[PDB]
Short mmCIF file of N, CA and C and ligand atoms in Angstrom, two decimals:
data_model
loop_
_atom_site.label_atom_id
_atom_site.label_comp_id
_atom_site.label_asym_id
_atom_site.label_seq_id
_atom_site.Cartn_x
_atom_site.Cartn_y
_atom_site.Cartn_z
N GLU C 1 141.02 59.75 91.57
CA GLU C 1 141.52 61.07 91.95
C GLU C 1 140.38 62.01 92.37
N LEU C 2 140.20 62.18 93.67
CA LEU C 2 139.10 62.96 94.20
C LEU C 2 139.47 64.43 94.32
N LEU C 3 138.78 65.28 93.57
CA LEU C 3 138.95 66.72 93.69
C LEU C 3 137.74 67.37 94.35
N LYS C 4 137.93 68.55 94.92
CA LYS C 4 136.85 69.27 95.57
C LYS C 4 135.79 69.75 94.56
N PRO C 5 134.54 69.33 94.75
CA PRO C 5 133.51 69.86 93.85
C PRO C 5 133.36 71.37 94.00
N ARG C 6 133.37 72.09 92.88
CA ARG C 6 133.30 73.55 92.87
C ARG C 6 131.88 74.07 93.06
N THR C 7 130.94 73.27 92.58
CA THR C 7 129.53 73.61 92.57
C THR C 7 128.73 72.32 92.69
N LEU C 8 127.42 72.46 92.91
CA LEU C 8 126.53 71.29 92.89
C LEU C 8 126.62 70.54 91.54
N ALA C 9 126.64 71.27 90.43
CA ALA C 9 126.75 70.61 89.13
C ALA C 9 128.04 69.81 89.03
N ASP C 10 129.12 70.39 89.54
CA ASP C 10 130.42 69.72 89.56
C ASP C 10 130.36 68.44 90.41
N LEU C 11 129.78 68.56 91.60
CA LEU C 11 129.54 67.40 92.45
C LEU C 11 128.82 66.27 91.72
N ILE C 12 127.74 66.61 91.01
CA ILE C 12 126.96 65.62 90.29
C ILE C 12 127.83 64.91 89.24
N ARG C 13 128.65 65.67 88.53
CA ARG C 13 129.55 65.10 87.53
C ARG C 13 130.52 64.11 88.17
N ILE C 14 131.10 64.51 89.30
CA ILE C 14 132.01 63.65 90.05
C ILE C 14 131.31 62.38 90.54
N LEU C 15 130.07 62.50 91.00
CA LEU C 15 129.32 61.32 91.43
C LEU C 15 129.09 60.36 90.27
N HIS C 16 128.84 60.87 89.08
CA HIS C 16 128.69 59.98 87.95
C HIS C 16 129.99 59.20 87.72
N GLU C 17 131.11 59.81 88.01
CA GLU C 17 132.40 59.13 87.85
C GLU C 17 132.57 58.06 88.94
N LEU C 18 132.26 58.44 90.17
CA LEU C 18 132.43 57.53 91.31
C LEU C 18 131.53 56.31 91.23
N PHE C 19 130.38 56.44 90.56
CA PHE C 19 129.47 55.31 90.39
C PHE C 19 129.53 54.71 88.98
N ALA C 20 130.60 55.00 88.26
CA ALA C 20 130.79 54.44 86.92
C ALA C 20 130.90 52.91 86.97
N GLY C 21 131.39 52.40 88.09
CA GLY C 21 131.59 50.96 88.27
C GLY C 21 130.47 50.25 89.00
N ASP C 22 130.72 49.00 89.40
CA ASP C 22 129.69 48.15 90.00
C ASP C 22 129.66 48.22 91.51
N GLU C 23 130.75 48.69 92.08
CA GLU C 23 130.86 48.75 93.52
C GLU C 23 130.99 50.21 93.98
N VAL C 24 131.01 50.41 95.29
CA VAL C 24 130.90 51.73 95.88
C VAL C 24 131.98 51.92 96.93
N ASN C 25 132.83 52.92 96.74
CA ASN C 25 133.80 53.29 97.75
C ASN C 25 133.18 54.29 98.71
N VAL C 26 132.66 53.79 99.82
CA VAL C 26 131.87 54.61 100.71
C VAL C 26 132.61 55.82 101.27
N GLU C 27 133.86 55.61 101.68
CA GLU C 27 134.61 56.70 102.28
C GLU C 27 134.92 57.78 101.25
N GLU C 28 135.15 57.39 100.01
CA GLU C 28 135.43 58.36 98.96
C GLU C 28 134.19 59.18 98.61
N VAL C 29 133.04 58.51 98.51
CA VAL C 29 131.79 59.21 98.21
C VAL C 29 131.47 60.19 99.34
N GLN C 30 131.58 59.72 100.58
CA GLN C 30 131.37 60.58 101.73
C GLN C 30 132.32 61.79 101.76
N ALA C 31 133.58 61.55 101.41
CA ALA C 31 134.58 62.62 101.40
C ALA C 31 134.23 63.70 100.39
N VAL C 32 133.83 63.28 99.21
CA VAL C 32 133.47 64.20 98.15
C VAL C 32 132.19 64.98 98.50
N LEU C 33 131.20 64.30 99.07
CA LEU C 33 129.98 65.00 99.50
C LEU C 33 130.28 66.06 100.55
N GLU C 34 131.11 65.70 101.53
CA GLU C 34 131.50 66.63 102.58
C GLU C 34 132.30 67.82 102.03
N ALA C 35 133.07 67.58 100.98
CA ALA C 35 133.92 68.63 100.42
C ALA C 35 133.14 69.70 99.64
N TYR C 36 131.97 69.35 99.13
CA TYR C 36 131.14 70.36 98.46
C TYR C 36 130.63 71.36 99.49
N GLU C 37 130.98 72.63 99.33
CA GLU C 37 130.48 73.66 100.24
C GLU C 37 129.10 74.09 99.80
N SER C 38 128.11 73.87 100.65
CA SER C 38 126.73 74.19 100.30
C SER C 38 126.61 75.63 99.81
N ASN C 39 126.02 75.80 98.63
CA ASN C 39 125.77 77.13 98.11
C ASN C 39 124.29 77.25 97.80
N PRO C 40 123.53 77.94 98.67
CA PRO C 40 122.07 77.93 98.54
C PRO C 40 121.55 78.30 97.16
N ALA C 41 122.23 79.21 96.45
CA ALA C 41 121.75 79.62 95.13
C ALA C 41 121.70 78.46 94.15
N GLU C 42 122.59 77.48 94.34
CA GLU C 42 122.70 76.38 93.40
C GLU C 42 121.61 75.34 93.59
N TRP C 43 120.99 75.32 94.76
CA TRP C 43 120.00 74.27 94.99
C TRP C 43 118.63 74.83 95.36
N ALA C 44 118.46 76.15 95.31
CA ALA C 44 117.16 76.75 95.62
C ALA C 44 116.02 76.14 94.81
N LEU C 45 116.31 75.79 93.55
CA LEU C 45 115.32 75.18 92.65
C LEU C 45 114.70 73.92 93.24
N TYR C 46 115.48 73.17 94.02
CA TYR C 46 115.02 71.88 94.53
C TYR C 46 114.44 71.96 95.93
N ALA C 47 114.63 73.10 96.59
CA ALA C 47 114.27 73.23 98.00
C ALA C 47 112.81 73.65 98.15
N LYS C 48 111.94 72.71 97.82
CA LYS C 48 110.50 72.95 97.87
C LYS C 48 109.94 72.35 99.13
N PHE C 49 109.45 73.20 100.04
CA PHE C 49 108.95 72.76 101.34
C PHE C 49 107.45 72.53 101.34
N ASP C 50 106.99 71.70 102.27
CA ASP C 50 105.58 71.54 102.58
C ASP C 50 105.40 71.92 104.04
N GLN C 51 104.28 72.53 104.39
CA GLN C 51 104.13 73.02 105.76
C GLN C 51 104.05 71.90 106.78
N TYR C 52 103.55 70.75 106.36
CA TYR C 52 103.14 69.71 107.31
C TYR C 52 104.11 68.55 107.45
N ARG C 53 104.93 68.30 106.44
CA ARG C 53 105.90 67.20 106.56
C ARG C 53 107.11 67.45 105.68
N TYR C 54 108.16 66.64 105.84
CA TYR C 54 109.34 66.85 105.00
C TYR C 54 109.09 66.36 103.57
N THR C 55 109.76 67.00 102.61
CA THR C 55 109.59 66.65 101.21
C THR C 55 110.85 66.06 100.60
N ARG C 56 110.67 65.25 99.56
CA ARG C 56 111.79 64.63 98.86
C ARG C 56 111.80 65.13 97.43
N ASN C 57 112.93 65.66 96.98
CA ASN C 57 113.00 66.40 95.72
C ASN C 57 114.14 65.88 94.86
N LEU C 58 113.79 65.18 93.78
CA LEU C 58 114.78 64.50 92.96
C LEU C 58 115.62 65.52 92.22
N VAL C 59 116.94 65.36 92.30
CA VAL C 59 117.89 66.28 91.71
C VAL C 59 118.55 65.65 90.49
N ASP C 60 118.97 64.40 90.64
CA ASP C 60 119.61 63.69 89.54
C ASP C 60 119.25 62.22 89.58
N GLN C 61 118.94 61.67 88.40
CA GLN C 61 118.49 60.29 88.32
C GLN C 61 119.62 59.30 88.27
N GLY C 62 120.85 59.79 88.26
CA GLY C 62 121.99 58.90 88.26
C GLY C 62 122.24 58.20 86.94
N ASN C 63 123.01 57.13 87.00
CA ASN C 63 123.47 56.46 85.80
C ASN C 63 122.93 55.04 85.71
N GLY C 64 121.88 54.78 86.49
CA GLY C 64 121.38 53.44 86.69
C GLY C 64 121.67 52.92 88.08
N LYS C 65 122.65 53.50 88.76
CA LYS C 65 123.11 52.91 90.02
C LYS C 65 122.88 53.76 91.27
N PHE C 66 122.41 54.97 91.05
CA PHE C 66 122.15 55.84 92.20
C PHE C 66 121.15 56.94 91.86
N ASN C 67 120.53 57.49 92.89
CA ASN C 67 119.68 58.67 92.85
C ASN C 67 120.20 59.78 93.77
N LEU C 68 120.02 61.06 93.43
CA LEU C 68 120.45 62.15 94.27
C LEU C 68 119.24 63.03 94.48
N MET C 69 118.93 63.35 95.73
CA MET C 69 117.73 64.11 96.01
C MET C 69 117.95 65.07 97.15
N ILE C 70 117.07 66.05 97.27
CA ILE C 70 117.17 67.03 98.34
C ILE C 70 115.91 66.94 99.19
N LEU C 71 116.09 66.80 100.50
CA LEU C 71 114.97 66.72 101.44
C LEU C 71 114.86 68.02 102.23
N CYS C 72 113.63 68.50 102.38
CA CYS C 72 113.37 69.76 102.99
C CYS C 72 112.54 69.54 104.23
N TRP C 73 113.11 69.91 105.38
CA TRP C 73 112.54 69.63 106.69
C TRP C 73 112.10 70.92 107.35
N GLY C 74 110.79 71.11 107.47
CA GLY C 74 110.30 72.26 108.21
C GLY C 74 110.66 72.14 109.68
N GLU C 75 110.55 73.24 110.42
CA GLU C 75 110.76 73.22 111.86
C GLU C 75 109.94 72.11 112.48
N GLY C 76 110.62 71.18 113.15
CA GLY C 76 109.92 70.14 113.87
C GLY C 76 109.56 68.94 113.03
N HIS C 77 109.89 68.96 111.74
CA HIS C 77 109.60 67.83 110.88
C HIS C 77 110.59 66.69 111.12
N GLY C 78 110.08 65.47 111.15
CA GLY C 78 110.94 64.31 111.29
C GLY C 78 110.43 63.12 110.50
N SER C 79 111.25 62.07 110.47
CA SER C 79 110.94 60.85 109.78
C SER C 79 110.45 59.78 110.76
N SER C 80 109.98 58.67 110.20
CA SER C 80 109.77 57.43 110.93
C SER C 80 111.11 56.83 111.29
N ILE C 81 111.11 55.84 112.18
CA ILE C 81 112.25 54.94 112.31
C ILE C 81 112.21 54.04 111.09
N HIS C 82 113.28 54.02 110.31
CA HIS C 82 113.21 53.29 109.04
C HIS C 82 114.53 52.65 108.61
N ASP C 83 114.43 51.81 107.61
CA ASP C 83 115.52 51.14 106.98
C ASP C 83 115.79 51.75 105.61
N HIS C 84 116.81 51.24 104.93
CA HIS C 84 117.15 51.70 103.60
C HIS C 84 117.24 50.63 102.49
N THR C 85 116.53 49.54 102.66
CA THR C 85 116.19 48.63 101.56
C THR C 85 117.44 48.16 100.84
N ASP C 86 118.42 47.74 101.64
CA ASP C 86 119.68 47.17 101.16
C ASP C 86 120.50 48.11 100.28
N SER C 87 120.29 49.41 100.45
CA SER C 87 121.06 50.42 99.73
C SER C 87 122.02 51.18 100.63
N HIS C 88 123.07 51.72 100.02
CA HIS C 88 123.88 52.76 100.64
C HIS C 88 123.05 54.02 100.76
N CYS C 89 123.18 54.77 101.85
CA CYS C 89 122.45 56.01 102.01
C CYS C 89 123.37 57.06 102.59
N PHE C 90 123.70 58.08 101.80
CA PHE C 90 124.51 59.20 102.28
C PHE C 90 123.62 60.40 102.54
N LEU C 91 123.93 61.15 103.59
CA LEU C 91 123.12 62.28 104.00
C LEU C 91 124.02 63.47 104.29
N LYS C 92 123.95 64.51 103.45
CA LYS C 92 124.78 65.69 103.67
C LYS C 92 123.93 66.90 103.98
N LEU C 93 124.25 67.60 105.06
CA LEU C 93 123.46 68.78 105.42
C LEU C 93 123.81 69.95 104.51
N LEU C 94 122.79 70.53 103.88
CA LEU C 94 122.99 71.71 103.05
C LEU C 94 122.64 72.99 103.79
N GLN C 95 121.76 72.87 104.78
CA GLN C 95 121.31 74.00 105.59
C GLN C 95 120.68 73.49 106.88
N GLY C 96 121.03 74.12 108.01
CA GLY C 96 120.44 73.77 109.29
C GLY C 96 121.13 72.58 109.95
N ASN C 97 120.44 71.98 110.91
CA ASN C 97 120.91 70.79 111.60
C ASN C 97 119.83 69.72 111.63
N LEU C 98 120.24 68.46 111.70
CA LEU C 98 119.31 67.36 111.90
C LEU C 98 119.80 66.48 113.02
N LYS C 99 118.87 65.94 113.79
CA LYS C 99 119.23 64.93 114.79
C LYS C 99 119.04 63.55 114.19
N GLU C 100 120.04 62.69 114.35
CA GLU C 100 119.93 61.31 113.89
C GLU C 100 119.94 60.39 115.09
N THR C 101 118.93 59.54 115.21
CA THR C 101 118.87 58.58 116.30
C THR C 101 119.01 57.19 115.70
N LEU C 102 119.94 56.40 116.22
CA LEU C 102 120.18 55.04 115.72
C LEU C 102 119.43 54.01 116.54
N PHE C 103 118.86 53.03 115.86
CA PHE C 103 118.19 51.92 116.51
C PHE C 103 118.72 50.60 115.97
N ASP C 104 118.70 49.56 116.80
CA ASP C 104 119.03 48.24 116.31
C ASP C 104 117.83 47.61 115.62
N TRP C 105 118.09 46.68 114.71
CA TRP C 105 117.02 45.87 114.15
C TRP C 105 116.31 45.16 115.30
N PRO C 106 114.96 45.19 115.31
CA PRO C 106 114.25 44.50 116.39
C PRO C 106 114.32 42.98 116.29
N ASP C 107 114.08 42.33 117.42
CA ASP C 107 113.81 40.90 117.44
C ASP C 107 112.33 40.67 117.18
N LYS C 108 111.95 39.43 116.89
CA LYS C 108 110.60 39.15 116.43
C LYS C 108 109.58 39.37 117.54
N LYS C 109 110.06 39.30 118.77
CA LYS C 109 109.22 39.55 119.93
C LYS C 109 108.91 41.03 120.08
N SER C 110 107.64 41.34 120.35
CA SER C 110 107.20 42.71 120.53
C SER C 110 107.90 43.37 121.72
N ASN C 111 108.66 44.42 121.43
CA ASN C 111 109.40 45.14 122.45
C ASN C 111 109.59 46.59 122.06
N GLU C 112 109.72 47.44 123.07
CA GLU C 112 110.11 48.83 122.87
C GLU C 112 111.43 48.90 122.12
N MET C 113 111.49 49.72 121.07
CA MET C 113 112.76 49.97 120.41
C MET C 113 113.52 51.05 121.16
N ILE C 114 114.64 50.69 121.76
CA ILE C 114 115.44 51.65 122.51
C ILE C 114 116.57 52.22 121.66
N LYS C 115 116.76 53.54 121.74
CA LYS C 115 117.84 54.24 121.06
C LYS C 115 119.19 53.61 121.36
N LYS C 116 120.01 53.47 120.34
CA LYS C 116 121.36 52.94 120.50
C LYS C 116 122.28 54.12 120.77
N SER C 117 122.05 55.20 120.03
CA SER C 117 122.84 56.42 120.17
C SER C 117 122.17 57.55 119.39
N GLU C 118 122.69 58.76 119.54
CA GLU C 118 122.18 59.86 118.75
C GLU C 118 123.26 60.87 118.51
N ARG C 119 123.15 61.61 117.41
CA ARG C 119 124.11 62.65 117.13
C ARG C 119 123.50 63.79 116.36
N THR C 120 124.18 64.92 116.40
CA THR C 120 123.72 66.10 115.70
C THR C 120 124.52 66.25 114.43
N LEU C 121 123.82 66.23 113.30
CA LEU C 121 124.46 66.43 112.01
C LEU C 121 124.40 67.91 111.68
N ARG C 122 125.56 68.51 111.43
CA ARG C 122 125.65 69.95 111.22
C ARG C 122 125.90 70.31 109.77
N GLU C 123 125.71 71.59 109.44
CA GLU C 123 125.86 72.05 108.06
C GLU C 123 127.15 71.56 107.42
N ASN C 124 126.98 71.05 106.21
CA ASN C 124 128.03 70.52 105.34
C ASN C 124 128.59 69.15 105.75
N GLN C 125 128.20 68.64 106.91
CA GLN C 125 128.65 67.29 107.29
C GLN C 125 127.95 66.23 106.44
N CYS C 126 128.62 65.10 106.17
CA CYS C 126 127.97 64.02 105.45
C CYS C 126 127.98 62.76 106.29
N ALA C 127 126.80 62.26 106.64
CA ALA C 127 126.69 60.99 107.35
C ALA C 127 126.37 59.85 106.40
N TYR C 128 126.53 58.63 106.89
CA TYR C 128 126.28 57.45 106.08
C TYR C 128 125.53 56.41 106.89
N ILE C 129 124.56 55.76 106.27
CA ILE C 129 123.91 54.63 106.92
C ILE C 129 123.64 53.51 105.93
N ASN C 130 123.61 52.28 106.42
CA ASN C 130 123.10 51.15 105.66
C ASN C 130 122.46 50.19 106.64
N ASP C 131 121.73 49.20 106.13
CA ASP C 131 121.00 48.28 107.01
C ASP C 131 121.92 47.52 107.97
N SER C 132 123.17 47.30 107.56
CA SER C 132 124.12 46.56 108.41
C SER C 132 124.50 47.38 109.64
N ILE C 133 124.41 48.70 109.51
CA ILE C 133 124.69 49.62 110.61
C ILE C 133 123.49 49.72 111.55
N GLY C 134 122.30 49.68 110.98
CA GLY C 134 121.09 49.69 111.79
C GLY C 134 119.99 50.48 111.12
N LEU C 135 119.00 50.86 111.92
CA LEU C 135 117.87 51.71 111.50
C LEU C 135 118.10 53.12 112.03
N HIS C 136 117.39 54.10 111.52
CA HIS C 136 117.47 55.40 112.11
C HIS C 136 116.24 56.26 111.97
N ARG C 137 116.19 57.31 112.77
CA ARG C 137 115.16 58.32 112.63
C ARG C 137 115.92 59.61 112.42
N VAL C 138 115.44 60.46 111.52
CA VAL C 138 116.08 61.75 111.27
C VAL C 138 115.06 62.85 111.54
N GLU C 139 115.45 63.88 112.29
CA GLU C 139 114.49 64.92 112.68
C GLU C 139 115.10 66.31 112.69
N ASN C 140 114.31 67.29 112.27
CA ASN C 140 114.71 68.67 112.48
C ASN C 140 114.09 69.11 113.80
N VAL C 141 114.88 69.15 114.87
CA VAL C 141 114.30 69.49 116.17
C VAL C 141 114.26 71.00 116.37
N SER C 142 114.78 71.75 115.40
CA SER C 142 114.76 73.22 115.49
C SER C 142 113.34 73.79 115.51
N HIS C 143 113.13 74.80 116.35
CA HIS C 143 111.87 75.52 116.40
C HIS C 143 111.90 76.72 115.47
N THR C 144 113.09 77.08 114.99
CA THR C 144 113.19 78.32 114.21
C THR C 144 113.86 78.20 112.84
N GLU C 145 114.58 77.11 112.59
CA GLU C 145 115.35 76.98 111.35
C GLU C 145 114.94 75.76 110.54
N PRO C 146 114.47 75.96 109.31
CA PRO C 146 114.28 74.82 108.41
C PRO C 146 115.62 74.17 108.07
N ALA C 147 115.61 72.87 107.78
CA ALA C 147 116.82 72.17 107.39
C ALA C 147 116.67 71.68 105.98
N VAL C 148 117.79 71.58 105.28
CA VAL C 148 117.82 71.03 103.93
C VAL C 148 118.97 70.04 103.85
N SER C 149 118.70 68.85 103.33
CA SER C 149 119.76 67.84 103.25
C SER C 149 119.81 67.24 101.85
N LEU C 150 120.99 66.74 101.51
CA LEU C 150 121.29 66.15 100.21
C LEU C 150 121.49 64.67 100.41
N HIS C 151 120.66 63.86 99.76
CA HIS C 151 120.70 62.42 100.00
C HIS C 151 121.08 61.68 98.73
N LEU C 152 121.97 60.71 98.88
CA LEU C 152 122.39 59.86 97.77
C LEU C 152 122.11 58.43 98.15
N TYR C 153 121.36 57.73 97.29
CA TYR C 153 121.07 56.33 97.54
C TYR C 153 121.57 55.47 96.40
N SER C 154 122.16 54.32 96.73
CA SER C 154 122.66 53.43 95.70
C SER C 154 122.56 51.97 96.15
N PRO C 155 121.80 51.13 95.42
CA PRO C 155 120.96 51.44 94.26
C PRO C 155 119.80 52.33 94.66
N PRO C 156 119.12 52.92 93.68
CA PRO C 156 117.90 53.64 94.03
C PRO C 156 116.88 52.73 94.67
N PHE C 157 116.03 53.26 95.55
CA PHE C 157 114.91 52.46 96.03
C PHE C 157 113.68 53.34 96.24
N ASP C 158 112.50 52.75 96.08
CA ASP C 158 111.29 53.55 96.20
C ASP C 158 110.33 52.99 97.24
N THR C 159 110.77 51.97 97.99
CA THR C 159 110.01 51.51 99.16
C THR C 159 110.96 51.28 100.32
N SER C 160 110.42 51.34 101.53
CA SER C 160 111.19 51.02 102.73
C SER C 160 110.21 50.69 103.86
N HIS C 161 110.71 50.32 105.03
CA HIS C 161 109.82 50.03 106.15
C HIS C 161 109.88 51.10 107.21
N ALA C 162 108.74 51.34 107.84
CA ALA C 162 108.66 52.18 109.02
C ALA C 162 108.49 51.25 110.20
N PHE C 163 109.12 51.57 111.31
CA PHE C 163 109.07 50.72 112.49
C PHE C 163 108.33 51.41 113.62
N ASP C 164 107.45 50.67 114.28
CA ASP C 164 106.72 51.17 115.43
C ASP C 164 107.63 51.13 116.65
N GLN C 165 107.94 52.30 117.20
CA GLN C 165 108.90 52.39 118.29
C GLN C 165 108.45 51.60 119.53
N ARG C 166 107.15 51.42 119.68
CA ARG C 166 106.60 50.73 120.85
C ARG C 166 106.78 49.21 120.78
N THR C 167 106.79 48.66 119.56
CA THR C 167 106.70 47.21 119.37
C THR C 167 107.77 46.63 118.45
N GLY C 168 108.38 47.49 117.63
CA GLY C 168 109.34 47.02 116.66
C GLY C 168 108.68 46.46 115.41
N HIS C 169 107.35 46.46 115.38
CA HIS C 169 106.64 45.95 114.21
C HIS C 169 106.83 46.89 113.02
N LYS C 170 107.03 46.31 111.84
CA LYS C 170 107.31 47.12 110.67
C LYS C 170 106.19 47.06 109.64
N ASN C 171 106.10 48.10 108.84
CA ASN C 171 105.24 48.11 107.68
C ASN C 171 105.86 48.79 106.49
N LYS C 172 105.56 48.28 105.31
CA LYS C 172 106.17 48.77 104.09
C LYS C 172 105.52 50.07 103.65
N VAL C 173 106.34 51.04 103.26
CA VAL C 173 105.87 52.34 102.83
C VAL C 173 106.41 52.62 101.44
N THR C 174 105.60 53.22 100.57
CA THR C 174 106.10 53.63 99.26
C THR C 174 106.65 55.05 99.36
N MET C 175 107.85 55.25 98.82
CA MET C 175 108.50 56.56 98.82
C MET C 175 108.05 57.32 97.59
N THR C 176 107.70 58.58 97.77
CA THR C 176 107.26 59.42 96.65
C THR C 176 108.14 60.65 96.53
N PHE C 177 108.11 61.27 95.35
CA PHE C 177 108.84 62.51 95.13
C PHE C 177 107.90 63.70 95.06
N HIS C 178 108.21 64.74 95.84
CA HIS C 178 107.46 65.99 95.87
C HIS C 178 107.70 66.77 94.59
N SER C 179 108.92 66.67 94.09
CA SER C 179 109.29 67.29 92.82
C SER C 179 110.39 66.49 92.14
N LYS C 180 110.57 66.71 90.85
CA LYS C 180 111.64 66.07 90.10
C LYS C 180 112.26 67.12 89.20
N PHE C 181 113.57 67.31 89.33
CA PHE C 181 114.33 68.27 88.52
C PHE C 181 113.72 69.66 88.58
N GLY C 182 113.23 70.03 89.76
CA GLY C 182 112.74 71.36 90.00
C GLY C 182 111.27 71.53 89.68
N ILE C 183 110.66 70.47 89.15
CA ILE C 183 109.24 70.48 88.76
C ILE C 183 108.37 69.75 89.79
N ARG C 184 107.38 70.45 90.34
CA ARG C 184 106.44 69.85 91.29
C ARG C 184 105.71 68.70 90.61
N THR C 185 105.67 67.55 91.27
CA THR C 185 105.02 66.36 90.72
C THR C 185 103.97 65.85 91.68
N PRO C 186 102.79 66.49 91.67
CA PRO C 186 101.70 66.09 92.56
C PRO C 186 101.30 64.65 92.33
FE1 FE2 H 201 116.92 57.48 106.30
#
């Protein structure tokens, strides 16, 4: 029984219910994330920006099966082309817009990675990706507005690959947290 989350705290409680089991109802999780109306006062604690790149800010450690975090994208900040390490990955916009570009998994032969498609993710929308869908790059192309997004991963993961757009060659990257539960973790 999916009800509208009243607050971020309410959302988190509902997510603990949705991940109480071993499997994941993707459409239900996405629906609930989209139904939470972003309220900046509730997540200001986690919205810690860096001038030079986007930051990842742990919000909830989950129940063993998922992590919830907030990413803060300065004007012009973007990601690598990357994968999600066999996890579900939900992305909900809390503030601003992000551009998502989809790429196919490369073949072993060195080749330019060509965009499959692209879309604009707008405030309060929730997108979903997994490795079966493809790879992606996420970017704040705004010159004037910072973006903030809410990310849910299940299972949690702390490494992934970055892909060279020119060749499709990949390398493993360790994921770090800029803060945890509102506390800066240098
Ligand atoms: Fe991603």
